[PDB]
Amino acid sequence: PVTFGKNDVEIIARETLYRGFFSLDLYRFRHRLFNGQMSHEVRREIFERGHAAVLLPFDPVRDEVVLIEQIRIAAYDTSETPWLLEMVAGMIEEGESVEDVARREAIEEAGLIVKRTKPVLSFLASPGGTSERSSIMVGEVDATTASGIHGLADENEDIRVHVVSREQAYQWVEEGKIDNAASVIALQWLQLHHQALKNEWA
Amino acid sequence: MLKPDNLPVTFGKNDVEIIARETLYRGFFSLDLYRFRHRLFNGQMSHEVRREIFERGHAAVLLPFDPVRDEVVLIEQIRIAAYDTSETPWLLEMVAGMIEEGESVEDVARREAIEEAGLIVKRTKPVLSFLASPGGTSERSSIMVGEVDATTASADENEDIRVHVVSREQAYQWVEEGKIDNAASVIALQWLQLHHQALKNEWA
Ligand SMILES: [Gd+3]
Ligand SMILES: [Gd+3]
C-alpha cells in the first residue's frame, strides 16, 4: 500500500510557538510528491501534548463494561454537555509502559484492580494537528468492586464510575451518547470481538 | 414548563460556568486557555480551573463504500505529526475536509470526494460524529458512508494525494494489524465491518 517513508521527508526544522503545560510546535519540511518530485517548504502547526494509554474495563462473567464520567470543557462548544462517558486513561510519563500506565489509572480512576490485560489498538487522534497517540488495551475486571464519588474531590480529575452492560454501552456509541475517540474505538472493538474474548477469558 | 433534555451523564452545561478564555497563541490554528468552575460529584463547587485548548476547527469525514463490489476507496497522504510515533508519516485515510460557515457536513463530504478521490458520491448516510481528544482539543469530526462505484476511482490533488481501492475485508484487516491507525479511518472501518450486510441490503 503506502510507498514513501522517512527518507522521503526532510524536516528542515521545528520550533515551539507556545509552551505552558502543553506545547504547540511548528514543523517545517519538504517531501516526495506522488509524482516523484519534492515539495516546497511546507509548514504545519502541531499540538504536542504527549501520548496516551487507555484501558477498556471489561467484566467477562457479567458481560458488563465500567465507564468513567468527568468533565472536558473542550467538548463544550459542540456537545450538549462537557461531561463525558470515557474509558480509563492517563498520560504516559517518562519510561512507563502503556500496560502499567493503564493498570495504574484503573485503580486511581475507577478503583478497580485489573487482572489480565490484552492489547487492542493504537491510534492517532488526529494526524492533521496533533502528534498524540493512544494505545487502548482491554482489561479484565470485577464490575462489582468499582469505587464511588470522593468526598474530598480531585478537582483536576474528578470522576464518577458508571457500570452498564456491554450491549448497552455499545448502543450508546451507535446512538451518539458516547463520542470521544478512545471510547468509540475500544467499544467498537469489543462489539466485534467480545464472544471470542469471553471464551478466551473465564 | 418544557422538561429538561436527557443526559446519559450526571451534569449539564448549567453546572459549569466559563469565566473567560485568555489566548495563549494564535495562528491558523489557535491555542486558547479556558478558565472555569463546575460542580463536583460531591455536590460542591470547584475552585477555578485553567486548561489549554487546541482550537482546530471541525471536520467532515466520508467513507467511500461500494456495496455491490464490497470495496472501499482509500486516500494515501502525509501527516507529519505521525512522524515521531509511526514508521511513516504517510497514512491511509478517509475523505475529509474542514467545515466552515454556511457549509453542511454532507456538502464538504461530497465536495472533498471529488477533489481528493475523484469519485462521485451517490447516496450518503450519517454514520457517527466523534470528538478527537476532548482533553486538549475541541476538534469534532462527523462521519458518513458514501455510496460509491470503485471502478470510478481516479484527480486534482493526485500529486499530493494517492487513491487506493481495496476490498472491505482487506481494509479491516489493515486496521486489525495497524496499517490503518488514524482515528477517522479506524472508527469508520469498524463501524462498516459491523453494518455492511445491512448497508448492502439498504442500498441494494
Ligand atoms: Gd490520572
Ligand atoms: Gd479540500
UniProtKB/Swiss-Prot annotation, chain B:
Cofactor (UniProt): Mg(2+)
Keyword hit for Magnesium: yes
EC assignment: 3.6.1.13
Cofactor mode of binding and number, as noted: Binds 3 Mg(2+) ions per subunit.
Keywords: Hydrolase, Magnesium, Manganese, Metal-binding
Protein residues bound to Mg(2+) 1: 96, 116
Binding site for substrate: 28-29, 51-52, 56, 79, 98, 133-135, 139
A GO BP annotation: response to heat
Task performed by this protein: Acts on ADP-mannose and ADP-glucose as well as ADP-ribose. Prevents glycogen biosynthesis. The reaction catalyzed by this enzyme is a limiting step of the gluconeogenic process.
Subunit structure: Homodimer.
Protein name: ADP-ribose pyrophosphatase
Protein's organism: Escherichia coli (strain K12)
